[PDB]
């Protein structure tokens, strides 16, 4: 029944959003909730944000 | 009967049917958004009966 | 209410330097300071690369026969390059190179504005004795962050196929530390000094950066002095 | 590289003594730095008769 076939191939670039999950190899799990400018950013006498 | 790949579909402008080749189907390297037609399809209906 | 003005400006490397304000009444160097950083690490105008179109490539996601840097790779290390303009709010520099050996960042066309600060750059390698890149490189200036996926909204037919956008990172200021230290005027109360110590790409001079910024503070609490 | 001024400013009056201004559109985390910038120069140093 099928006379041809076309497959197209995306390639998506997501970066990273409120939402998405994250997680360390300790069991700790999270989800990304505020995206903060780094100046808002705790930071050290250094200067350097986290 | 049966549907054609053809890039002549109805109802839609000359900025729809941009991103398509002449066989209908989307360049390599075209960068595409939701909704974009990467291949265009057209199915036989008979009669619409409007 | 003595109001402050600069002191030294300590150049140290190409890349930070250390400027001072002298005569600070009590606390104002921590509201300054702060206050300084705030506009410094974030509002400042910037240029970097936005803009790539190489010459065979049709997308970001191929492989150049003769380079053994990613197409995709080869973008992110421009929006590395730093450069600055002068009269142009974009320029579009021509990058042309070939031979087995470094595409550093000072084979690119000189234009007159145009000051490449660290022309050891590594674009990419090249691994075959005839292997040639060419590519347009569209530097344009602005202020923050503006990513690659908010620029294709104007777009109104970008269709050059082969123009690879990248995401611009415009900003001169890396990381911003503001120490307050006591400075004893030969005769006064208690004053203390503002040292600012900061750290840039080289693409804006240390008091220019910390006038616009300060120029900035003004200009936003024009309004706030009155209703 | 032109900035953000802000518009609208309604002031609501609470009694005589204190009140609520309000300052829409800033651009981004600058409610902070002048917020904060005038918060410090308030509590702190002012002209005063105690």
Do not use: W
Request: charged share 25%; hydrophobic share 40%.
């Amino acid at each position: 029944g099928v006379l041809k076939i076309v497959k197209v191939y995306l390639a998506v670039k997501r970066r990273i959003q409120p939402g998405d999950k994250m997680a360390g190899r300790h069991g700790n799990k999270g989800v990304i909730s505020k995206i903060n400018p780094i100046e808002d950013m705790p930071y050290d006498e250094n200067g350097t944000p986290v | 009967g049966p549907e054609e790949i053809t890039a002549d579909i109805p109802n839609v402008g000359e900025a729809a049917l941009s991103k398509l080749d002449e066989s209908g189907i989307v360049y390599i390297g075209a960068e595409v958004t939701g909704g974009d037609i990467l291949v265009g399809k057209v199915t036989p209906k008979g009669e619409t009966q409007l | 209410f003595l109001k402050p003005r600069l002191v030294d400006i300590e150049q140290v490397s190409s890349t930070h330097a250390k400027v001072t304000l002298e005569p600070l009444e009590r606390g104002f160097g921590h509201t300054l300071g702060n206050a300084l950083r705030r506009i410094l690490l974030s509002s400042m105008p910037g240029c970097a690369v936005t803009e790539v179109e190489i010459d065979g490539v049709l997308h970001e996601y191929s492989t150049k026969e003769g380079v053994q840097e990613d197409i995709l790779e080869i973008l992110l290390n421009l929006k590395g390059l730093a450069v600055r303009v002068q009269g142009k709010d974009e320029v579009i520099l021509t990058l042309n190179k070939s031979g087995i050996g470094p595409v550093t960042a000072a084979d690119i066309t000189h234009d007159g504005d145009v000051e490449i600060v660290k022309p050891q750059h590594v674009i990419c390698h090249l691994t075959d004795e005839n292997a040639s890149i060419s590519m347009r490189i569209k530097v344009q200036r602005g202020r923050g962050y503006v990513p690659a996926s908010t620029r294709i909204h104007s777009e109104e037919d970008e269709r050059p196929i082969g123009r690879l956008l990248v995401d611009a990172c415009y900003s001169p200021v890396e990381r911003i530390a503001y120490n307050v230290e006591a400075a004893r005027v030969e005769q006064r109360t208690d004053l203390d000094k503002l040292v600012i110590e900061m750290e840039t790409n080289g693409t804006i001079d240390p008091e220019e950066a910390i006038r616009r910024a300060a120029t900035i503070l003004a200009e936003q609490l024009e309004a706030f002095v009155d209703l | 590289t032109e900035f953000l001024k802000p518009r609208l400013v309604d002031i609501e009056q609470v009694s005589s003594t204190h009140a609520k201004v309000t300052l829409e559109p800033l651009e981004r985390g600058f409610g902070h730095t002048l917020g904060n910038a005038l918060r410090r120069i308030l509590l702190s140093s002012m002209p005063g008769c105690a």
